[PDB]
Amino acid sequence: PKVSEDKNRNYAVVAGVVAIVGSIGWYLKA
Amino acid sequence: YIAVPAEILGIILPLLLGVAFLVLAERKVMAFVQRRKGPDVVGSFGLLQPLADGLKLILKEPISPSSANFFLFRMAPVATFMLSLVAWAVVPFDYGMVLSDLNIGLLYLFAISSLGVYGIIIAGRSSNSKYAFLGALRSAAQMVSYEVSIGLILITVLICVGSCNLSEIVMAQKQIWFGIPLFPVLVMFFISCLAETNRAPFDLPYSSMGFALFFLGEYANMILMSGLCTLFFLGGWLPILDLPIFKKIPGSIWFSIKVLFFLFLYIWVRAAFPRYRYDQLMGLGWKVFLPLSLAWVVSVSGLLVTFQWLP
Amino acid sequence: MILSVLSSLALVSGLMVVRAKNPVHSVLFFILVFCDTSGLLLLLGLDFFAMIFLVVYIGAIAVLFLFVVMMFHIQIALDNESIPLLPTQRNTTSLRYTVYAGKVRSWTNLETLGNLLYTYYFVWFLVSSLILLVAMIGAIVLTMHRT
Amino acid sequence: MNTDITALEKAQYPVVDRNPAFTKVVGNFSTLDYLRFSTITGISVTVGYLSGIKPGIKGPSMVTGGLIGLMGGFMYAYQNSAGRLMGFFPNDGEVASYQKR
Amino acid sequence: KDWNTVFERSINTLFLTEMVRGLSLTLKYFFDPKVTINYPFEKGPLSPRFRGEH
Amino acid sequence: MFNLFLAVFPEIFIINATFILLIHGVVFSTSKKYDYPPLASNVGWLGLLSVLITLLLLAAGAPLLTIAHLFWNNLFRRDNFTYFCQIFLLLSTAGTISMCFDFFDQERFDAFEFIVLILLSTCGMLFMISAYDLIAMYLAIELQSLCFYVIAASKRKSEFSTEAGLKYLILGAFSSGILLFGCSMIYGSTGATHFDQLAKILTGYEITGARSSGIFMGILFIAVGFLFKITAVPFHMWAPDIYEGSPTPVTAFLSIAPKISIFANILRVFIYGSYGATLQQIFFFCSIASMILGALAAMAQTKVKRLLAYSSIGHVGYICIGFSCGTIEGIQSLLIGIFIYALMTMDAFAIVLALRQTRVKYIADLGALAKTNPILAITFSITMFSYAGIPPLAGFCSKFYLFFAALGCGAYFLALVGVVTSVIGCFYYIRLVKRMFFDTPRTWILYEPMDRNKSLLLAMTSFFITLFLLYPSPLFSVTHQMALSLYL
Amino acid sequence: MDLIKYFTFSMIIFILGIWGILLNRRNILIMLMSIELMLLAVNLNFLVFSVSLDDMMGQVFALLVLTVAAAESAIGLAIFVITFRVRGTI
Amino acid sequence: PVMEKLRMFVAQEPVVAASCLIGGVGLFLPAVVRPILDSL
Amino acid sequence: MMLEFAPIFIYLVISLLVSLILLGVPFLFRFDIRFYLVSILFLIFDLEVTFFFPWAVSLNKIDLFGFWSMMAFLFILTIGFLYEWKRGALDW
Amino acid sequence: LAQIHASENSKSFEQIEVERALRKKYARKDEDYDSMLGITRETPPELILPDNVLPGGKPV
Ligand SMILES: CCCCC/C=C/C/C=C\C/C=C/C/C=C/CCCC(=O)O[C@H](COC(=O)CCCCCCCCCCCCCCCCC)COP(=O)(O)O[C@H]1[C@H](O)[C@H](O)[C@@H](O)[C@H](O)[C@H]1O
Ligand SMILES: CCCCCCCCCCCCCCCCCC(=O)O[C@@H](COC(=O)CCCCCCCCCCCCCCC)COP(=O)(O)OCC[N+](C)(C)C
Ligand SMILES: CCCCCCCCCCCCCCCCCCCC(=O)O[C@H](COC(=O)CCCCCCCCCCCCCC)COP(=O)(O)OCCN
Numbered sequence A: 001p002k003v004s005e006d007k008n009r010n011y012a013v014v015a016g017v018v019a020i021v022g023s024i025g026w027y028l029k030a
Numbered sequence B: 001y002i003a004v005p006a007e008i009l010g011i012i013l014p015l016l017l018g019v020a021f022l023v024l025a026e027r028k029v030m031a032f033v034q035r036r037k038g039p040d041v042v043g044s045f046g047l048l049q050p051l052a053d054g055l056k057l058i059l060k061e062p063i064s065p066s067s068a069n070f071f072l073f074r075m076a077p078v079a080t081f082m083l084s085l086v087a088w089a090v091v092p093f094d095y096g097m098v099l100s101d102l103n104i105g106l107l108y109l110f111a112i113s114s115l116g117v118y119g120i121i122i123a124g125r126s127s128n129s130k131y132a133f134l135g136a137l138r139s140a141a142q143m144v145s146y147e148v149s150i151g152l153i154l155i156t157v158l159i160c161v162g163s164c165n166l167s168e169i170v171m172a173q174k175q176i177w178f179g180i181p182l183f184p185v186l187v188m189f190f191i192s193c194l195a196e197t198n199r200a201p202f203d204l205p206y207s208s209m210g211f212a213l214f215f216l217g218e219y220a221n222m223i224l225m226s227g228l229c230t231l232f233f234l235g236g237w238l239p240i241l242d243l244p245i246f247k248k249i250p251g252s253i254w255f256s257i258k259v260l261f262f263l264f265l266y267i268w269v270r271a272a273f274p275r276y277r278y279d280q281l282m283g284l285g286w287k288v289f290l291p292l293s294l295a296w297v298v299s300v301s302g303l304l305v306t307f308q309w310l311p
Numbered sequence C: 001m002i003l004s005v006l007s008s009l010a011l012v013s014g015l016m017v018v019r020a021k022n023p024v025h026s027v028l029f030f031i032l033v034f035c036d037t038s039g040l041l042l043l044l045g046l047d048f049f050a051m052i053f054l055v056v057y058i059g060a061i062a063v064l065f066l067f068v069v070m071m072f073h074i075q076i077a078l079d080n081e082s083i084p085l086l087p088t089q090r091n092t093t094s095l096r097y098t099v100y101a102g103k104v105r106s107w108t109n110l111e112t113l114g115n116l117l118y119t120y121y122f123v124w125f126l127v128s129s130l131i132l133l134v135a136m137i138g139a140i141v142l143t144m145h146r147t
Numbered sequence D: 001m002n003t004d005i006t007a008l009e010k011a012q013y014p015v016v017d018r019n020p021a022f023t024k025v026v027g028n029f030s031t032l033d034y035l036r037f038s039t040i041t042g043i044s045v046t047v048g049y050l051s052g053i054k055p056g057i058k059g060p061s062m063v064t065g066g067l068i069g070l071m072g073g074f075m076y077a078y079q080n081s082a083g084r085l086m087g088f089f090p091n092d093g094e095v096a097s098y099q100k101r
Numbered sequence E: 001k002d003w004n005t006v007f008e009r010s011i012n013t014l015f016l017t018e019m020v021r022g023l024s025l026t027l028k029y030f031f032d033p034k035v036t037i038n039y040p041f042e043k044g045p046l047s048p049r050f051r052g053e054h
Numbered sequence F: 001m002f003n004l005f006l007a008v009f010p011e012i013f014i015i016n017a018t019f020i021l022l023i024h025g026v027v028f029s030t031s032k033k034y035d036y037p038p039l040a041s042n043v044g045w046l047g048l049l050s051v052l053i054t055l056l057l058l059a060a061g062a063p064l065l066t067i068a069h070l071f072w073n074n075l076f077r078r079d080n081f082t083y084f085c086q087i088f089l090l091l092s093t094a095g096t097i098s099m100c101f102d103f104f105d106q107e108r109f110d111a112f113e114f115i116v117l118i119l120l121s122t123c124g125m126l127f128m129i130s131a132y133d134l135i136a137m138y139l140a141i142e143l144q145s146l147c148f149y150v151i152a153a154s155k156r157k158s159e160f161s162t163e164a165g166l167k168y169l170i171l172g173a174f175s176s177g178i179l180l181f182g183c184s185m186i187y188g189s190t191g192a193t194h195f196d197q198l199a200k201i202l203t204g205y206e207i208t209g210a211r212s213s214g215i216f217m218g219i220l221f222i223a224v225g226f227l228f229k230i231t232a233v234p235f236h237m238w239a240p241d242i243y244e245g246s247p248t249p250v251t252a253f254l255s256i257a258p259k260i261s262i263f264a265n266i267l268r269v270f271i272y273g274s275y276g277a278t279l280q281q282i283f284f285f286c287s288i289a290s291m292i293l294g295a296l297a298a299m300a301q302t303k304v305k306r307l308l309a310y311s312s313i314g315h316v317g318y319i320c321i322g323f324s325c326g327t328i329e330g331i332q333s334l335l336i337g338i339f340i341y342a343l344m345t346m347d348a349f350a351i352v353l354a355l356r357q358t359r360v361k362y363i364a365d366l367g368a369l370a371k372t373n374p375i376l377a378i379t380f381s382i383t384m385f386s387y388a389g390i391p392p393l394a395g396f397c398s399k400f401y402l403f404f405a406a407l408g409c410g411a412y413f414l415a416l417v418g419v420v421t422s423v424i425g426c427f428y429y430i431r432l433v434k435r436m437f438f439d440t441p442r443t444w445i446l447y448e449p450m451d452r453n454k455s456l457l458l459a460m461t462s463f464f465i466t467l468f469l470l471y472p473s474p475l476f477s478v479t480h481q482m483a484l485s486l487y488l
Numbered sequence G: 001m002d003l004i005k006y007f008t009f010s011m012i013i014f015i016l017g018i019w020g021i022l023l024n025r026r027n028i029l030i031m032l033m034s035i036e037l038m039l040l041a042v043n044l045n046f047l048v049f050s051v052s053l054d055d056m057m058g059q060v061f062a063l064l065v066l067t068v069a070a071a072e073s074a075i076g077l078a079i080f081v082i083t084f085r086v087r088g089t090i
Numbered sequence H: 001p002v003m004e005k006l007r008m009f010v011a012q013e014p015v016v017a018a019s020c021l022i023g024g025v026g027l028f029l030p031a032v033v034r035p036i037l038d039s040l
Numbered sequence I: 001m002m003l004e005f006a007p008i009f010i011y012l013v014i015s016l017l018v019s020l021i022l023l024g025v026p027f028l029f030r031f032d033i034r035f036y037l038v039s040i041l042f043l044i045f046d047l048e049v050t051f052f053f054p055w056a057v058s059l060n061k062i063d064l065f066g067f068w069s070m071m072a073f074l075f076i077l078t079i080g081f082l083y084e085w086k087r088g089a090l091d092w
Numbered sequence J: 001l002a003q004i005h006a007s008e009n010s011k012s013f014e015q016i017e018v019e020r021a022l023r024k025k026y027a028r029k030d031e032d033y034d035s036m037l038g039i040t041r042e043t044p045p046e047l048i049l050p051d052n053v054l055p056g057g058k059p060v
Helices: A007-029 B004-033 B049-058 B072-089 B105-114 B117-126 B130-161 B166-171 B183-196 B209-232 B251-272 B278-306 C002-018 C023-043 C047-072 C109-117 C122-142 D022-026 D031-051 D059-086 D092-100 E003-014 E017-030 F002-007 F009-029 F040-060 F080-099 F101-106 F113-129 F134-152 F159-190 F195-200 F213-230 F239-245 F248-254 F257-273 F278-298 F304-324 F328-356 F376-388 F395-408 F412-437 F452-466 F473-485 G003-023 G029-053 G057-087 H005-012 H014-039 I003-028 I034-057 I066-086 J002-009 J013-025 J031-037
Strands: none
Touching: A007 D031, A007 D059, B004 B049, B004 B072, B004 B209, B004 B251, B004 E017, B004 I003, B072 B105, B072 B117, B072 B209, B072 I003, B105 B130, B105 B166, B105 C047, B105 I034, B117 B130, B117 B209, B117 C047, B130 B166, B130 B183, B130 B278, B130 C047, B130 I034, B166 B209, B183 B209, B183 B251, B183 B278, B209 B251, B209 I003, B251 E017, B278 H014, B278 I034, B278 I066, C002 C023, C002 G003, C002 G029, C023 C047, C023 G003, C023 G029, C047 C109, C047 G029, C047 G057, C047 I034, C109 G057, C109 I034, C122 F113, C122 F134, C122 G057, C122 I034, C122 I066, D022 D059, D031 D059, D031 F040, D059 F002, D059 F009, D059 F040, E003 E017, E003 H005, E003 H014, F002 F009, F009 F040, F009 F113, F009 I066, F040 F080, F040 F101, F040 F113, F080 F101, F080 F113, F080 F248, F080 F257, F080 F328, F080 F452, F080 F473, F101 F328, F101 F452, F113 F134, F113 F257, F134 F159, F134 F248, F134 F257, F134 G057, F159 F195, F159 F213, F159 F239, F159 G003, F159 G029, F159 G057, F195 F257, F213 F257, F213 F278, F239 F248, F239 F304, F248 F257, F248 F304, F248 F328, F257 F278, F257 F304, F257 F328, F278 F304, F278 F412, F304 F328, F304 F395, F304 F412, F328 F376, F328 F395, F328 F452, F328 F473, F376 F395, F376 F412, F376 F452, F395 F412, G003 G029, G029 G057, G057 I034, H005 H014, I034 I066
């Protein structure tokens, strides 16, 4: 059972991770 | 300058005679379509029937239904007669055969058509019958909903001309008639004129001269819309596109011939198809013609602008 | 002459509008007011604006007011800026200078308006569009009862 | 139609290519511009997903928020890049790249 | 279904192709002999068994 | 060509976001798969996100607001005053949207068009502040007026909402007609509608030789219409009724957002319309009457919303004190008062909406609030004292600096009226504080806990109100910068 | 003199609209017809001034005020219709 | 997908699809074709 | 330029006279809300067609800017019309 | 009265979550918006008690 099934929820997780990483880079690169 | 009333009489009286003979022509063409003959006993070929009808409705000793204000009821047919005839002052029949050559003629026609809603509304309320009132309200809503599409089609035509002068719209079709490129626009305009006049599948519906004036106004509207259909798309008075040897025929004859063709289309369409329902009239007129008219405006304007083919 | 009567009838119609017992008669005189105003505009040479007044005022708003009144209840109810010129035109009419340079290519009131309505002042055009959209949206939300 | 790109307040940084084209501004995007673009898009997508759970539409709200964030982030990045090219923002790298051109 | 079928039935919806087929029939009946009779002059056919005036 | 539109990205973004939200709501509200979801909170959250993103677009692009100024000259003028006014307006709109979230759930207001109309009104006000012409000013005024007319009568089944909507409609249309007649008489006398032209043509002839009747009457009519818009007496014909009958989340927005933009218009009219200090007298009388009537009318109020409406009228008069004295310090006092009043009003309306979940209508209803919720009572008392103007709080700074501006111009009569009105105001503001803490009602009303958005809004605004005096420098600096930029 | 007559006519229309607003406080339809009379008078002033000064800034604004007047009519009649349903009277 | 949702929309909404198509053509000509001809 | 409306006015007068003559010829011897929505839509689209009137005639002077301004105007009203559509205001 | 308690105390985890979601969804109502949309939201049978335990047997 090592698979997350909800495709929509997975995309939300990816978007949240991308938002956090981009915010960290924005606060660092500028 | 005292000859202007002569011109107005010469454009008004033959219009009434043509309306009467148009009623006769409808009752004859439907009879021929359905494998019979129309009125034939009265005249040599029934040509005297409208005169007999007129003398009948004149000589009826009728009573006035004074169970109302008696003013709005009596003037509503007069108002719709006003509006039906006043639109003929700008329609040109040949090069210089127009009573009033406005430079805003297309917009004046749009205004006159939009102001025709009041007569039926006033007649509907003035009659104490609530059911006639509701029917008049429905007819007014239908006329409004299709006048919108008529205006949009007018925009489609006006884009290619660049002027609101009716006599210049015809001269703009010297190369080719606008009915050839914009054939779907022509079909939509004809159908909208069918729905505007409360006629054809779009025709959901007191005594003596009030009903006579309403009847005459409706048939004058039919003639005027046939004239507009041949005026914007069929080249008006311009001859046939090819074979220029028959040029001895006056231009006023070609306009008449095309108007008669469109009147035959009115009679044909009403004879050949059943009636629509009100819940389908509004749905059709708001969901099939408004989007299509808007899309055609957009397409024509975009194509003319792109290749710099504008007037 | 034509101005005086076409203004007097409009004043009487407006007075009857603001002092009408039956609202249907008020709507009718309301229509007559704009019927006279269209002629007054025609006297100014603004042919387009008079026609639009016929189309908009007594073609859409007046019809809407008539719909509301009818089907619903029909219930009961000078010397400072521009000093005027005195009538001395026997010699003034002869003193009319006409410049043909402005007549060789003359624009109609319609194309004169459309020359700058859509290019040099297009933001106001879009703001009016937004106002129309607001009216469209607000008509439904206030008055809508399906099934 | 006659147009003028001059601004009331003069640019306080070196100006290169005073009236840049859309393609040239888009091709001037830096790492920071992509970072802020992605940050705005991801924030909008997350907000759309979280807000649409109660009505029951996660995917549709996700896509609507994604469109809003995409448009907003792209216009923000375009604004920054155009300002850098036009001299209204510190164009430390733009002048370095375009001096050797 | 097929794209060809969708295109074919969408064209017929828009081009009114099932109403032209009725207009053609009505027009073809327009140019045809009539079957009406001049009652005062010619009468309709009857039978020797006809039951009329006593 | 595309770079000429760098000056309108904040408006383009908000317009397109409103369109996308409208499409999303209309498509998914009338859906069968999701069983007609009530997606008002979804649209509200996405609209708040759109407001924040256009705030980021507008604030970051500060050097680019003057771009293509010649091309946009006839349409709008963007400068430092417009920049800060628009940022403040967006912040207020975001705060109102944040407050109105709990209204959509507990009361079950499922209409998503509320947020769309709020966003469209926001667009109208953005175009209003940067408007630099009579035409654009009137168009933006009408846009926001209709957006408010529609949402004032949102509660269709409510008796008060429909009547309030009708009254607001009639009053606003009459005021717009008066304003338009004034604009027409100005145009017919000077031949110009742009503010630059209308300032150049009026700055010379300061009624030195004769009084131009047309210009004077047009200026007076515009002033009268604007005074109707802000509801300064005797032009408050139906303002308390409109405030009471309107929905509370709606009433919160009309009490803050329209005033900022209308005051921006009045300032950009004073930059040219100072025709022999004619408006200074009108605003003098209006401010005196507004202070007096608000003070004398809010004492005879037993309902919370009518008292808030009369407080708004009184604070409008206090702000118009700054209009009466035409000076850089006067305008600075005016803007500081606007900012502080907007923040206090947002605080008070968030508190009211917190108690609105339990149907609060009278002041006596909030009687035992100091026992059931002993921190909400403290916050409400802080807001009331800030309204009163007690020195330690932030509401005292605005009244102080307004009185200073009034005394600078030499209008000693304004100072006495302001002092007496302040005494009366503090009396009926501490009257409310008496009810919460000192009275012991026989029957208590228990209110349900508030939500997170309003909780943080209350916390931030209450920390601002109490601790503003310690660090007030940035507000004074930005206000002085704004006041000077009105001319240079 | 013609500008004086046009301005006097428009001013009288404006005054009649204001009177209808004030006098007919009981009725609602008249309180919308009066607003429309006011807007009509203002549009007439703008058009007359544009013709008198030979300037196109009055015609553009009259055309733009047409939209505002029509939208106000629509919203007003919708509000009146919903108002009658609730309280059952005018 | 796209080739199925588009088919379903076109089949049950022929007039809307046709209007959208002709409007899209009329917007595509002055957006993609006019600049191309501007080079020539 | 505007001399061509006097024939129309005399035409109106004579049409009135002939209508009165025709009238004198025989003398010698609940509420539905959709009716409001249709009127609202008509008002909006009548204003739209009114705005088309200057654009179509002056489409030769303006070029690729007035066209796109009209296109944005149409896009806004088309979003409004789509809202009218899905909300069921176009049904009966 | 024992029957409703027995039917409530024996539910599974999956049924409890569904009933909680339904109870939250129908806790508050908005008749005006439903009338605007032409729909009529009705309480699901899982949130309806038998009429024989009501104070007087209320059918509506
Ligand atoms: C002891 C020393 C350390 C001590 C410090 C430890 C630190 C631990 C490391 C990271 C902490 C991360 C904090 C970030 C937290 C963010 C808030 C959590 C957001 C969240 O609900 O999750 C996802 C949502 O998805 C996103 O829409 C947005 C979610 C995107 C963000 C999730 C990505 C998390 C990955 C973090 C990287 C992990 C890398 C490894 C970390 C472990 C180290 C080995 C689950 O959705 P869902 O539909 O099933 O359910 C949610 C949820 O139940 C509630 O929000 C609502 O009640 C419900 O309506 C629904 O929204
Ligand atoms: C391009 C210009 C703008 C065009 C639109 C303008 C008008 C705005 C209209 C916005 C409202 C409509 C938005 C599209 C609605 C359709 C959403 C969609 O396509 O996704 C679907 C399905 O499609 C998907 O596969 C999910 C797509 C969402 C994830 C996509 C990644 C996030 C993209 C956001 C950022 C990019 C912007 C969008 C792409 C341009 C929804 O998923 P569900 O039906 O809930 O999943 C079914 C399973 N279950 C029922 C159990 C829940
Ligand atoms: C020389 C003279 C020639 C003749 C001139 C006169 C022409 C008319 C002659 C008579 C024609 C028949 C008239 C019948 C009258 C009633 C017909 C109305 C029926 C109708 O409205 O059809 C609708 C759809 O079809 C429609 O939409 C119909 C309008 C379609 C217009 C054509 C648009 C085609 C666009 C193609 C563009 C391609 C070229 C440019 C690239 C409803 O039908 P429904 O029930 O299915 O409801 C659609 C739901 N979805």
